[PDB]
Each structure stands twice: as structure tokens, then as C-alpha cells.
Symmetry: D4
Subunit: 184 residues, 8 copies
């Protein structure tokens, strides 16, 4: 639910920072690259992922949304939890990790401590395949559950909703028109 924490850095440690937002100091477990520019007394915005478990609520902090999304993708692999996903991002930068998934570079993934040959192969197996107005509307309709390329049918059908040629009429209006059509 918490996608970022912005406020005064109260503490910077080698594995976390405390950021005070509206009087609340949030402990954010962060990668060394996210912590790099953080200094005590300075204002900072850390991009975060909140992990909720029965006996814990923990924030993980990243230098950007790309690394945060990679952390969440790592977390979706069975056998990979928050500590291992953070260790992976501490060793590999976003581009290096994204590259290792595309090239099935099990050897670089095993450089992360806690990730052995089996774990690296599971990560590659799970994340290799999981790593303009028309494309966005189709993507949003597929995201809503309109499967088997039916999103393409109702999006190309709203080719009449441009009488005075509005360029693209924005993705928000093109999606509302396709959804209106899909609901009969």
C-alpha cells in the first residue's frame, strides 16, 4: 500500500534508513544504492514496497520504481523472500538483473549469497518471460480480464470516436469508450 516515504532522514545505517513522514519515523530496509544519497537531517523520498505478514509489517526501499518492481517480481518466485530479494538487488543493479534474466545467466544470479544453482534456475524460469494509445487501452482491458485479444476488437472498434480528429483522445477516454462498448 505504501509506495513511497518522504521526509526527514533520522538515521542512515548500511542496510536501512529511518525516514520521518508527518511525525512517524518509518524504518525502511533499503539497498546500499538507495541509501547512497541519504544523509541524517536531510529530506528524502524513498520508493518502497510494504510487505505484510501475520506478525510483521516491513518497508523495503529502493532508488527507483524499477528496482522496487524487480523486488516484487523476485518476491513472487517460490523460495525467494524479502531478504533474498534485497540481497539480489544489493549485488545486481536493475539493468544487470534484467539482463541476467533475459540471458538465463544463472552464474551471475548465483553470485548473490543465498541463491544457489537451483534457486537461480527457479528465478530465471519464473521471471524470464515476466521481464501508443491502442497498446495502452488493450493492455488495460487485458488487465481487467478481457482475454483472447478481445481488447483489440473493442479498441479498434472505437475508431469513429474522433470526429474532429483529437489525435488519440487520451488513453483514459479511449478505455472508457471500449469498456462502455464491452458492457453492451
Amino acid at each position: 500500500m505504501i509506495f513511497s516515504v518522504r521526509g526527514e532522514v533520522l538515521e542512515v545505517a548500511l542496510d536501512h534508513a529511518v525516514i520521518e513522514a508527518a511525525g512517524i519515523g518509518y524504518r525502511v530496509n533499503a539497498t546500499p544504492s538507495a541509501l547512497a544519497t541519504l544523509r541524517q537531517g536531510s529530506q528524502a523520498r524513498l520508493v518502497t514496497a510494504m510487505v505484510v505478514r501475520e506478525d510483521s509489517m516491513t518497508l523495503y526501499g529502493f532508488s527507483d520504481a524499477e528496482n522496487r518492481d524487480l523486488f516484487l517480481a523476485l518476491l513472487s518466485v517460490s523460495g525467494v523472500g524479502p531478504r533474498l530479494a534485497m540481497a539480489t538487488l544489493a549485488v545486481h543493479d536493475a539493468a544487470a538483473l534484467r539482463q541476467a534474466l533475459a540471458d538465463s545467466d544463472v552464474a551471475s544470479l548465483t553470485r548473490v549469497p543465498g541463491i544457489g544453482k537451483r534457486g537461480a534456475e527457479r528465478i530465471v524460469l519464473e521471471l524470464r518471460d515476466k521481464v501508443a494509445v491502442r497498446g495502452s487501452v488493450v493492455e488495460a482491458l487485458v488487465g481487467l480480464g478481457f482475454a483472447a485479444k478481445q481488447a483489440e476488437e473493442a479498441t479498434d472498434q472505437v475508431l469513429d470516436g474522433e470526429l474532429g480528429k483529437d489525435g488519440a483522445v487520451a488513453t483514459s477516454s479511449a478505455l472508457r469508450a471500449a469498456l462502455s462498448l464491452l458492457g453492451k
Copy 2:
């Protein structure tokens, strides 16, 4: 617990927005109609429902309280979870969904992907009577029934306070008077 998030729109995506309220950016999964209202850099108040599960805390955002309440009504139907309730509100507007429930229009509900004939019939079955479309009386009686009072005992207490020393108190004032009377009764 969280019924709204107000602040700077940091991001608008096709299925969610990030709204920063007092330094915290909240990811709010929102319907396309709620997202149409949002633009990066603007201040916005998104009406929300917080869904708490053992391993998750998620905010769902709507253009108004009416759609948020309909999302919560959809969630109460067995077989309908947050993703399906959001897909339903993305396809049907508040009035159209309130209409399909009254008319038992299973065909319109089946237009929502993930909702088949069985699911549509479950939704209609569960929500037809739990949906809407002097006024003081009905509101007070409804609040007394909501507290656990039997409708007859709720009507009697409301009428005793609205017909006695009233004749045009506020609804909450009449509710406190009806509750005061119900706690004596004996």
C-alpha cells in the same frame, strides 16, 4: 479503515494511481473512471476501501462513495473478490450496476470478464434486496435496526420520540432520544 486518500497525484497508471498524503505515497488500485479524474501533479481526494488480508493491505479507489460502497457490496458476495469487484465497476457505472441488480439482468453482469452465468446469479441473489434505487423516521429506524433492535421495537421508539416532543429534532438527535428511551423501557 482508510475511506479516502487526499494529496498530490505522483503517478497515474492504467489500473492505479499513487497519491502522496503527508509524505506517504499510497498506491491506490482504481477504476478507469476514478483514474480519468487524476492527473500527475494535481491534488486529488480519492474515495477508497482498504482490503486487509493476512499477507496484504491494499487500497481500492473510486470516483465517489457510491461506487466504493458498491465495491464493498460486491466483495460480500462469495466468489467475488477485489479483482472481480473492480472489473465489475470498470464495466458498469454505479447506476447501471444498481439497475442490473433491481432488474436481475444476469446478461449485463455476465459482460464483466471473470463473471459467468453462475457468478452473475449469485451477485443478483445476494445484492438485489441489499441495494437502494418522514425521511427522519426511516433513517432513525434503520440506524436502530443496524444496532440490533427489532424493526417493530425500533418503529415504536422512533414514533414515541417523533410524535411526542418533536413535530419537526435532527435525525441524529432523534436517534439519541430513541436510544435513550430504549435503554429505560423495562
Copy 3:
């Protein structure tokens, strides 16, 4: 954890209010007496109890800390949950409820819908004694609260007093109690 919510009242309903504190609108299920002075657009501070469950996080709001503490006392009775504790506080004011517990007035408790003779007797059984109607008494109470026996708590306080501030006396009594090294 949340003991109060202060901010702009965004909505007032007959059973809840929405209060916006630092951009977040909190739904607070409140008693009719807590809602009485609340008006949309007005600033208000509602005294609250946060109830956490596997699939829920809910705030309950009261006109004062006394009613909030009575709600928490009602929750500690087996068979009484948040809805029943709120219904009890909607029917009985703090003084009336505290009185009914002391006098074992099962009939008044039975006026609350959802509370029958058995439930009223369980509430009276559990909360009569755990309900009400200076430096020494407070320090002894804090030591007992920490786990010290009432006998040992009284010995360390009187010893400390002969040698005011309640916190200062508590720190001195605790320093004395930890002496055996």
C-alpha cells in the same frame, strides 16, 4: 495503537464518521453520543480504539477515554465483540453502564439488543470488580503493573519516599528492586 483521530470531518453518518487526518480519511465507527457534535467540514478529535483482526483494521470512536476504555473492557468479555460493545455504549452512557456492573443490573444490560440474560450475566461476572464506581498509590500501582508483588511494591516505595514526583519515585523504587546483582 490509534488512540485518537483529529482532523476534518468529511462525513457524518448515524453510526460512523470519516475524519481526515494528514490527507487520510479514517472511517471511525462511533456511538451516537460521539457523533452528536460532529459536522461535515468541521475539525474534530475523536477518541478511538483500533481493532486488528486477520482480515480487518477498524477504528471505534467515543466521546471520551472513559467510554473507549469501557468498550475495551466489554471486548475482553468472551461472547462480546465490537458490534455488541458498540450497541452497549449506544444504549448506556458511561456512568449508567459502570453503575449496572456494580449493581449487577442484568435487566439494564439486557435492554441492549444482542445481549440476553446469559450475556448480561457474563458481562457482570467479568466486569464487576474490574470497574471503578497519591504518589505512593500510583508508584505501587505502576510496580504491580510491571509484575511486582503488592507486598514487595509497597516495601520499595515507602523506603524510597523516606530519603516528590511520581515518575522520580518510580525510577528510585525500580532502581532499589533491581539491586540484587
Copy 4:
């Protein structure tokens, strides 16, 4: 997740305080030493530990991070929960508790009500070794070990980094991690 609460002290009781941070009054169960510095109407920042359970979310407040970290160390001992860890910090200051752990002073720990000979021995057993010139080296090695690296591989990478360009600890950690992620 919550490491501190800062705001107006609305209430000071003998076992807790209410601190209002941005309109929210947080109940913080605090040690008598943490409550000693709190006074109604004053602004205060209380250092906290949030304990999350299936049916509860509770804040515990301390006079400093040292006592808060000792509370968290006490919580990690089986048989020691929040009430017993608070009673231990109410009876023993940060220095006395760390001294009793180093000296295996079971008798001092037994002074805390609720802790008997068995409990005191469990606490000593669990926390004696888990309790607290090139300081940069030791910190970097400790952070690498914390990420999952073996101490020998952590020392080798840190030394290769501090011996080649003989500045900051976080900067040296990022250099050691960069080196450790090399497939060579």
C-alpha cells in the same frame, strides 16, 4: 515499521503515553525512563518498536534507540514477550542489561518480575554473543555478512576495496558489493 513517533504529548500515564503525530494520537507503551522525559503539552519524539500480531498492533517506546534495540533482542528470546521485555527494561538500564549479559549475571536478570532462573539463563544463553583503528572495515564486513556473504569472502572483498583506493563506509560497501557481483 514505526521506529519513532514525534508530536504533542496528549497524555502521560505510568505505563504509556499518547503522542499526536499529524492528527493521530498514538498510544505508546513506554518504560518509566522513557515516560520521565514526557510531559503533557510538550513536543517529544519517542523511539519505538511496533509489534504486529494477528489481533494486535502495539507501539513500545523507549528513551533511545539503544533501549529499543535491547527490547527487540529480548523479544527474540523464546519465552520473552513484550510485557517481560518491558519489565526487564523498567528494572535494568541499557548499560546494566548489557553488563548482566556479558557477565552472565542470572541473579540480576532474576530481579525482573516474571523472569525466573530458567528464563534468565535462556536470555543470557541467547543474547551473550549477540550483544555489543579501521572501523570502516569492520562495518563493511558486518554489512556484507548481514547480506548473506561468508565472513572470509566479505573480508577479501572489503580488503581488495580498502587496499586499492585507501573513503566512507557506505561507499566502500557499494564497492565491495560491486566486486562481489563480478561473475569472475
Copy 5:
């Protein structure tokens, strides 16, 4: 897991029996029709459904497999638990209940205490439910699409002299599965 309990009836009550099988007396909550022929000291076989929960292990007993399967079908309806499913079978016999589901007879279901108009409508909504047909049904049960199940079963229309009607059902199923696995 336990589909029947056979042994000495140690106790017969109006809502349960105790049946001793291999030295263990099993309490079996049973419908009045299942209990009807049971007598203390007599041997009996009760058809059962074992319901496992975090804090309980309970046996429910029926006069036959048809009623036991109807109890399990009732349990699959949200809002219907073991007590309500037993009350339903105590009021309605298997044929009467199966009839009420087909005819959407909400009024008859409403005769069962604990089942109101809403519950009866949920139950009706949820429960409105030779070698070739059996093999296809078993293939569909394994996850095969009905069309792919029919095609594989029909392709095994071979066998000189040995039963022109696709030999034994288990033999035809093994042949259809062998074909489906390439």
C-alpha cells in the same frame, strides 16, 4: 477419508450412534432414517462422511451413499455447514431433496429449520445438478476437455472378437489415456 463404519452398535441416540470397529467406538452423527434400524449390541454398517476442521474430526452417517453424497453437495454451498446439511436430510429424504432442487422448490427447503428464503435460494442456485460415456466422464474428471476426451475414446473403437462395445471400461480408459499421452 472414512466412507463407512461397520461394527457393533454400542449406543443409539436420537441424533447419533456409537459404532465399534476394531475396538474403536466411533461417534457418528446420523440422520433419524440412518439410525432407524440401528440397535444396541447389533452389527451395522453406516455410510459416512468425515468432516475435518482445525479443532474437530466428525463423522456424519447416512442410510446410503446417495444421502451421504447429498450431504457433501449441501456442504459445498456457502452458508451451509454440517448441522444445516444434517437438518436438511432429517427433514427431506434423498428423492424429495433432489426433486426440490430440480423444481427450485424454495418453499420445501424453507421447511428445514435454519434455512430461510435466502439460504434456500442459494442451495437451489448452487445445486441444480455405457462404456463410452463412463470413459469420457473419467477423462473429463482427470482434466481433459470433453471434445478431446470423446475423440480419444472413439479412436479406441478396435478389438477383434473381444467385446465390440469398447471391452472393459477400465481397459478402454487406460487405452484412451495411453493415446492422450502420445
Copy 6:
């Protein structure tokens, strides 16, 4: 589910027995009165209650069904678990316990170790009301199925008058249920 265990008594201890039924030796925690009748090498049938929990499956054994049912009634009281219910039956016989509930004899219940004044009052409160013979039994079974007492009396009376007045309890129950299922 297990209401009795019959077989060879392999062991008799002060708080339990092992009874072998068809090759399986079952440990049955039993009251001293249930153990009094058990002797190693003898065949015995112990009346039992199986208590199932997430991490345990335990058998409790009694001299008869009356004590076993009283154990189950004690278990239904909040604050009373298997150990306390066994301690109660070890101190009070079936008749004495049934008497103490009727007379609200909190002092006798307080004689059981682990049961204080509060616990004794909870037990009395919960079990005082809980712990034409054909008519009463049929009505009780109909009420047990969920029928309202008035509708249960009306159906039972319609059955016992007309084609009865002679007509077993179970037979009358099946007739009352047949009548109750008649539409309108």
C-alpha cells in the same frame, strides 16, 4: 470422533493408560477413577473424548459416558481446557459435580486446583441450565435439529395422538419430522 477404546491394557500409569485396539496402542489420559478399574493384561473399554487441535490429537478417558459428557460440558466453558476439566473430574465425581452446578456451590468447585472463585463462577454460570418421556425426548431432538419448541411440541403431539398412544421414540421422531417437512 473416538467415543471409546476397547482392548488390552498394555500400561496403567497414575494419569493415563495405554489400550491396544487392533494392534494400535492408544494413550488415553484418564481420571484416577477410570484408571482404578484398569489392570495391565486385562481387556477394558474406556469411554473417551478426542480433543483435536492444530498440533495435537489427544484421548481423555472416563469410567462412564456420564463423566465423559461432563468433561465435554466443562470444555465448553471459556477458560476451562482439557487439563482443568480432568482435574475437576479427578476431585469431583459425576453426581457431586452435577450437584455443585445445581446448588451454585462455587466453594466445592474452588477445591479443584487451577479453579479460582472467578473460574468456579464461570463454570456455574455456563453449566447450571445446561448440565410422557417419549414426548420430551422427541421434542428435545426436534429442538436439537433447529425447530422452535412450540413447532416441535405441536408436531410431536399431532403424532403421539391419533396413530400412537402405545410407538418408539425414534419412530415418533421420524413421524414428527415427516409431518414438519410437509409444505405449508
Copy 7:
């Protein structure tokens, strides 16, 4: 816990059988090959795996221990539950499934309905390496199974198989290796 059920076959259905063992009829969900050998009225011993869940206790039956062990190996793969593991054994015989794992034959595994390319790759990834000199290998395997390091297991087994043993059963050699390993 239940590894087999032996008794009278009361019922044979297309997907399960009921086998009565000492008065209890057990429903055993079985593969079509396991059901092929079952006939109503006959005595049979079905090799089983009991799957325990919070709300269920289910028996799965196989023609032999080899298929039962393969079912348990399939269950250990994330994404593969009892229904999918049974469907796999209904389509592929033992050693045919064992072959597809060794040869990474994802195409044969995808013939099982419910198993797609991703699932087949997960199964292959997880089970390829898992699913006199024979005495030595078995003893070493049992020592490794107990937690011993393979080198320490080989050293103890070799010290035992050379000296007081030259010709000395596998279990006897295991007890001798364990006796040696427990010496300080």
C-alpha cells in the same frame, strides 16, 4: 502416515475405490492403473499417500510404492497439488514419467491436462536431480539423510566396511557408522 490400505473392495468407481479395513471403509482416490486391479468383493492392498490439510484428510492410491513415491515427489513441486499429481500418473506410467524427467521432456509432461509449458518446466527443474558397493551407497545415503556431510558419511562408512566387516548387512553397517560418528 497411512502407507497402505488392505481389505475388502466394497466399491470400484472410475476415480476411486472404497476398501474396508477392519470395519472401516476408506475412500482411496486412485489412478486408473491402480483401479484396474480392483474388483468389488475381492481383497486388495492399495499402496497409499495420506494428504493432510486443515480441512481435509484424503487417501491417494497407487498400483505400487514406485508410483506412490512419484506422486509425493510431484506434490513437492510448487504449483503441483494432489489433483495434478494424480492426473500426471494417470497419463504417464512410472519410469515413463521418470524418463521424461531425466530427458527434460517438457512436451510429454504438457500432455497431462492442467500442466502447461511453465508447469512442466518447474516439474523437470525440481525433480530431474531428485526423482558391497550397494551397501556403501545406501549407508552413506542414510547418513546424509540424517544430516551428516557426505564426506563425514563416506569416512565413517568406509572405516566400518574395512576391518570388523569384509563380507555385515546395510542396517548393521549403518548402526556401526552411527556408533562411530557419535564418538567425541
Copy 8:
């Protein structure tokens, strides 16, 4: 609940046996010393401990009740589960383990794989010290929740008309007024 399984040994492996009791073959994970005398086709009685968890029901088998009780004592130590308790009993016999606890022999316990210095110290801390008619009756009364002094006072009062079961029944009748 299951304290023993007696029947035909269907299978003997190096870490478990299958014993058929009344038609049910029970897999019993057993120590090598418990398996030593077991042979396929032979009747055997294995002393067991049933471990119940949300997703499992497992039997552990031992050569006698002493080893089974030691397994249960090991299970009560935080950090020690069934696998580690079985590995401990596979390496150390009942007498050797009981000795190592009394003498705080952390080095012997550390010989068990999976048990390091910390684990061995936890086991020793939890299990050292923990752990005729008059003594038995007092022990049974204390086991029921009675105070050690109250148990001794009641049993000694039973020396007016005086069996360990008849003495316990007399002391329980005097303790309940």
C-alpha cells in the same frame, strides 16, 4: 495419541518401516536401533509418538518407551523438531543422551548433525533436571495441580484406614472437602 503400532512389517527401510495393523499400513519413521530387529513379513510392535501438524500426521518409532519419551522431551526444546530429535536418538542411545544432559556434555550433543554449540546448550538448559505408594500418590496429586505441601498433607492423612489407586482416590476425596 498413538503410543504403539503392532502388526506385520510390510517394509523395512534404513529410516522407517511400514507396519500393518488391522489392514492399515502405517509408515513409522524410526531410529536405526528401533529398525534393527524389524524384518519384512514379521510381526513387530514399535513404540511410537504421533506428531500432528496442520499439513501432516507422522509416526515416530522407537525401540522402547524410554527413547520415545526422550524424543518427546527433545521436541519440547525450542529449535528442536522431529528431524533433529530423530537424528539425536540415531547418534545417541537413551543412556548416553540422559548422561550428556546430566553432565552438560555439549560436545557429545554437538556430534549430532544439525545440532551446533548453541542448540546443544539450549537442549542441556531445557532438559537437565527437567528431567513408594506415598511418593506416587503425591506425584499424581502434584500432576493434577495440587501444591506439593497440600499433596503431602492429604496423602499422610490416608494412614488411618491403611493400593496406589485406592490411596489416590482417598486423598482426592479429602482434597475436595
